[PDB]
């Protein structure tokens, strides 16, 4: 219509060839997922694939010289089509969505209009089109103007619902006069149009045309100039009432355009799926065609039904990956990073706890007798759509897909975490009158007028009333025990920061529903994503900031260290840490020698840091917790580079390779790759110890953790595809 013109470069593919398309959209729909078309009414199987191109305007002439080619191909389609694109789309019948029970009427249609292209680098030519239209306007009658320069030249009958045909040759053995015949039926040609079509031949003495429905012709080749080796559909009709297409329109191109509705179909699948699940669905940051494919692989559990997924029409994922694949490998990706933020989240909120216990914590959380349990709360069940023929399938295997999802999407960790900390803790976890002072005490809450002796009273009504808002029971349980750790004035800081989150999430007002498992709720999320750090139990408390780091920042929550009430708390934990007096002495040694072996660039002034949390990772006793973190951060780590490196492969390809590199064997010969210093530190912590002990595959660990502890995500990131990764043995 105007300027406005997203473009597509087109390209569908048969066993013949390719065949591009400019399609130019009036609409935002990001990249738009290819996908193959089964074989069927009348065309054969075949593929169609995407591509962004640039945003070309348009001079309101050039819109209406677009028209007219449009119209063309509309005559060409047939009958069958109506012309316009955008109405051929929302005629299309349920049943032919990715989601037939979800059918939405959006606001908006989106326009298109598409072009030919001889190249998928060829430019835009808006005269070529004249050209083109032309040819088409001053197209002879086959009966105006030698069988073989018609030979494989595409011809359409006009007079005939302009069905389409391929030349392969004047049959002068016969003319238009001549006979066929049927069962129990003899006739002449002039005679059938005439009795059927109720059309009366001019030039009946004309020699009759010999060439192949382009229906049956589906996939087969054309013989040369009458060898004829498949002729059976092979049929003759009068030269008059055939329309010689220009060159150009040849097969390819024809029948090429006969997947355009379908082009058009898949824009409008979309937009429908977009608009009607979209809210229903756990946001990953995308939009558009992305945001569709991302949703017809969380919600289709199951494979298209012969004929597709959505219609005839199959959509794949980048690198022509199946939804079903994806799912399979953003689950086993979400696993392993929803790991690892729980595992890093309770190490926080229990820094007293011991690692047994924050294992025990961790399955309670990430456990799928839970995770099946989330996800009914989450209403997706219910759009989840498959024909009960698919075994080991699970409602819970959805959740660590989303998160696989949210991470691998626009908003990444950032994501995850928050998409984590909604759906763990909950009011709607825990059952249910009570006393006046509690009730006072909630309002007071409400509007921070409220103070230590309000909120203990809460938490004790709370403590003794078994109010839960994990969904896990000990879990919960164990987390108001922490609370009662917590001096009182420090909770409506917990508070406003869990009143802060459920309003960024739009899941809130400015302030709670003025409950106490609504009050209760607000401090776990606070407190979940809040605790600054942990105990190395008998040497300070560690902090987990390994997120100021990030490139991208977010203070309306976290805030900055330059100073918050939560953020003041991480850094005191820092400073002290630094405050402590380094007993340098080989300890301090081999930490600074694995500083500068590392390979890798790590943010500037973070190094002093570093080193302490290396000591910490050399000394025994004290490196527990390191570990339990390192090994939950190389399992995300490792999934991911393969994630990257492997786009094809499946979970247990992906499975079976970084387990491969994680075992203690592989991880502790790394360790021993540092400049001896630091094996002679190990066997001189550790009385006659051995080459393949433990501790030195456990050590490594407990560095990977003290590097993202203090340079940050990526580093340690750097750190295991550079050192790590290489150990990933290849399945072949
Ligand atoms: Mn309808
Ligand atoms: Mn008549
Ligand atoms: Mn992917
Ligand atoms: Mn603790
Ligand atoms: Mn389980
Ligand atoms: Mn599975
Ligand atoms: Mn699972
Ligand atoms: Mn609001
Ligand atoms: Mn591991
Ligand atoms: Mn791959
Ligand atoms: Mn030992
Ligand atoms: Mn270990």
């Known amino acids: 219509g105007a300027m406005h013109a997203l473009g597509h470069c087109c390209t569908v593919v048969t066993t013949r060839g390719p065949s591009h398309w400019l399609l130019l959209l009036d609409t935002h729909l990001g990249t738009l997922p290819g996908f193959k078309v089964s074989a069927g009414r009348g065309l054969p199987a075949a593929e169609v694939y995407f591509e962004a191109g640039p945003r070309v305007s348009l001079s309101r002439t050039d819109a209406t010289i677009v028209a007219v080619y449009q119209s063309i191909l509309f005559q060409l389609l047939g009958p069958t089509f109506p012309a316009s694109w955008t109405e051929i789309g929302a005629t299309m019948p349920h049943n032919e969505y990715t989601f037939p029970r979800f059918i939405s009427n959006p606001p908006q249609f989106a326009t298109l209009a598409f072009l030919p292209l001889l190249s998928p680098t060829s430019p835009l030519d808006l005269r070529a089109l004249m050209v083109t239209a032309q040819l088409m306007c001053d197209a002879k009658r086959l009966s105006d103007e030698l069988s073989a320069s018609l030979h494989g030249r595409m011809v359409a009958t006009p007079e005939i619902s302009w069905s389409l045909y391929v030349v392969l040759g004047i049959d002068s053995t016969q003319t238009s006069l001549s006979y066929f015949t049927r069962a129990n039926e003899s006739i002449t040609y002039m005679r059938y149009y005439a009795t059927a079509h109720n059309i009366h031949l001019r030039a009946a003495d004309l020699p009759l045309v010999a060439a192949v429905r382009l229906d049956d012709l589906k996939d087969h080749q054309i013989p040369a100039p009458g060898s004829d080796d498949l002729a059976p559909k092979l049929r003759f009709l009068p030269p008059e009432l055939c329309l010689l297409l220009p060159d150009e329109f040849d097969l ?158 626009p908003n990444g960790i950032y994501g995850c975490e928050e998409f984590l900390a909604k759906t763990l803790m909950s009011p709607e976890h825990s059952k249910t009158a009570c006393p006046d002072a509690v009730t006072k005490a909630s309002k007071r809450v409400c509007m921070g007028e409220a103070g230590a002796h309000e909120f203990r009273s809460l938490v004790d009504y ?248 203090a340079c940050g995500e990526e580093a340690a990131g750097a750190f295991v595809r550079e050192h790590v990764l290489p150990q990933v043995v290849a399945d072949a």
């Open 252 to 409: 390819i191109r024809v029948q090429a355009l006969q997947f355009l509705p379908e082009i058009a179909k898949h824009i409008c699948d979309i937009q429908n799926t977009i608009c009607a699940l979209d809210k229903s669905f756990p946001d990953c940051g995308r939009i558009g065609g992305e945001r569709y494919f991302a949703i017809t692989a969380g919600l289709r559990l199951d494979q298209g039904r012969g004929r597709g997924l959505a219609g005839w029409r199959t959509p794949f994922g980048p690198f022509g990956v199946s939804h079903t694949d994806v799912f399979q490998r953003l689950e086993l990706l979400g696993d392993a990073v929803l790991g690892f933020i729980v595992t890093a989240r309770l190490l926080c909120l229990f820094p007293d706890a011991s690692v047994g216990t924050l294992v025990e914590l961790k399955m309670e959380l990430v456990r799928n007798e839970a995770l099946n349990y989330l996800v009914q709360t989450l209403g997706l069940p219910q759009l989840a759509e498959f024909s009960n023929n698919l075994k080991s399938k699970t409602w819970a295997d959805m959740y660590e897909e989303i998160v696989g999802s949210i991470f691998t999407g």
């Open 462 to 709: 709370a403590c003794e009333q078994g109010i839960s808002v994990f969904c896990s029971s000990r879990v919960s349980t164990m987390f108001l025990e922490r609370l009662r750790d917590i001096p009182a004035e420090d909770m409506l800081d917990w508070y406003r920061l869990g009143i802060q989150f459920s309003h960024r999430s739009g899941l809130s007002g400015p302030g709670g529903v003025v409950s106490v498992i609504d009050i209760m709720t607000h401090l776990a999320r606070g407190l979940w994503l809040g605790s600054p750090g942990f105990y190395v139990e008998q040497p300070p408390t560690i902090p987990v900031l390994y997120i100021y780091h990030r490139s991208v920042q977010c203070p309306v929550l976290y805030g900055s260290l330059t100073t918050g009430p939560v953020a003041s708390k991480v850094l005191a934990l820092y400073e002290k840490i630094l405050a402590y007096e380094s007993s340098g002495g080989s300890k301090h040694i081999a930490a600074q020698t694995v500083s500068r072996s590392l390979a890798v660039p790590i943010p500037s002034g973070t190094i002093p840091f570093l080193i302490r949390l290396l000591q910490i990772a050399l000394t025994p006793h004290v490196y527990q917790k390191l570990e339990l973190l390192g090994d939950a951060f190389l399992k995300c780590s490792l999934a991911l580079h393969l994630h990257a490196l492997h786009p094809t492969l499946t979970e247990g390809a992906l499975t079976r390779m970084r387990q491969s590199a994680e075992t203690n064997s592989v991880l502790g010969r790394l360790t021993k790759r540092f400049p001896s210093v630091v094996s002679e530190v190990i066997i001189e912590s550790h009385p006659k110890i051995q080459p393949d002990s433990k501790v030195y595959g456990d050590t490594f660990e407990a560095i990977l953790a003290a590097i993202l502890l």
